[model samples]
Target: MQIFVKTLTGKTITLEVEPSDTIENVKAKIQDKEGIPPDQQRLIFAGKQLEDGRTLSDYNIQKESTLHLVLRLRGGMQIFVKTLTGKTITLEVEPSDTIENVKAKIQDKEGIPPDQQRLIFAGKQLEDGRTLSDYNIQKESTLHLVLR
Candidate 1:
């Protein structure tokens, strides 16, 4: 089966991994081919962690499926202010990361509670409770934020 793995740098490596291969094996292969450390590895889909020991069959991942494996970065500017400092945070994100994930990232950075965050794109308010996947953002899209 053909599987595509993409890193945080937006670099992708494709491999033909058998359905029987364990997730650990995939980790090792990613280490060998992509130079990603195992400890820092985070395999995400729709903004949630792919559980351990999950195989292609377990997740209904089919042939030629594309998976994104991201490596956690050491440091980045925080996106929110904890106390309503009235400062807007700008985040540079890949269009594929989705608008919700971007908002979550901002919440992580600024310490703003998730429920209180408002994400505006293109002068239209994003549907509440929707994620980046809902928006269909383009690559290298810039999201402007304002914390009320």
Candidate 2:
């Protein structure tokens, strides 16, 4: 079977795969071509995240189906920051960017000091000195920001 994969950057690539192929298999091929790690590639088909252990047929993916690939921050990932006041701010950050670096951006945009800011993603509090990719952060993932 053949499928079209569209990257976040608007680049589309065609892949030849079998219906029995697992999503991880597809990610491997993507990694070979795009240099994105399997952990960093989020494959979306039919509006849902594709699990690694599941076969393409499990998702009803057929020939020529378009799979949207949300690649992790090579250059940067666009994340949504939600404040305690219910405000949302969008920021672009690189995978190499530390939590403190993000806090600095938040300080500039949201006026929250780095020391006073707490970043949480997936219900986990993000720490300083750790890269964004270290937390497996993906594009458009929201991080909750709380101030002390």
Candidate 3:
């Protein structure tokens, strides 16, 4: 199997893996390459966090799946951004922030312009002129970022 690790939204390291491999097993491999210790490492997959005890097979991962390296998932004053290009960013956001402002933040971090970004939550494409609170986003909820 193939595993692509994306760190800090951009950097990546590709590794050949097997479904039987444990999360630690995979991190140990990354440990050897990226020099980051396994215990300090974290993985994100399928819009959720990865556990150290689980194996690739247990996760039901498709071969083309991407594994993101990140921490601190949440919403409200904070939220998560999941991108179609297989990257995500944790942001400090509030209900008062408008949809357009959020896109400016995303542009600063992800380099995608406001016009190109389509912020999606609960299966709806959030348009401009709306506040974050207008959409009723829940605590620690994740909004997906689909590009134009």
Candidate 4:
């Protein structure tokens, strides 16, 4: 069966894997491509820990499926700038916060002109219909802001 794996490098690799294969095999394949040591590998699926002895079949994972793997890396502090004063503003946002919610906060803080501000992140422009979840954002992730 064909399975898709997304690495932290933002690359999607498709491979033919069988449900009978253990998670250890997957780790080996990933280490081959990413050069990450197996001991440091943390394979997660559906927000759950995946062990070496576990089989794809045990998790009911299917072929031609896609798995997202996040590499552990330390990120620097998030810096956000205010639109008017060019000053920095610290926002405490959660994973559940949506783009619309942020727009509201911007409107309240800066009194931005109606329909004039835009929120861009990860090379994608966000609208009211978009959620932080759509951007694969986690809780406490910092977002940059700009007015366009």
Global Cα lDDT for candidate 4 = 0.65
Using Cα atoms with residue i matched to residue i, what is each candidate's TM-score against the true structure? Answer: 0.44, 0.48, 0.47, 0.44
> What would the per-residue lDDT of candidate 4 be over residues 54-110, giving only the tens digit for each residue?
787887788777776766543222224355446555543434446775666666656
**Residue 94, model 2, lDDT:** 58
Estimate candidate 2's alpha-carbon lDDT, on a 0 to 1 scale.
Answer: 0.83
The superposed Cα distance between candidate 2 and the true structure at residue 111, in angstroms, equals 32
Say which candidate scores most in TM-score.
2
Off by over 4 Å in 4: 73-148
User: Whole-model lDDT, candidate 1?
Assistant: 0.62
lDDT of 3 at 58: 85
- Give each model's whole-structure lDDT: 0.62, 0.83, 0.77, 0.65
Q: Write the per-residue lDDT of candidate 3 for residues 63-143, one digit (tens) a residue.
A: 757888753443326678898977768766766668886787788888877897888898898988998889987556787
- lDDT digits (tens) for residues 9-69 of candidate 2: 8888988788888889998888677666577778997788988988788899989988999
Ranking 2 against 4 by lDDT, winner: 2
The residue pairs in collision within model 4 are: 2-64
Q: If both were scored by lDDT, which would come out higher, candidate 3 or candidate 4?
A: 3
Full ranking by TM-score? 2, 3, 1, 4
Residue 147 error for model 2, in Å?
A: 43
Runs in model 2 deviating more than 4 A are 74-148
Cα deviation at 10, candidate 2, in Å, is 1.9
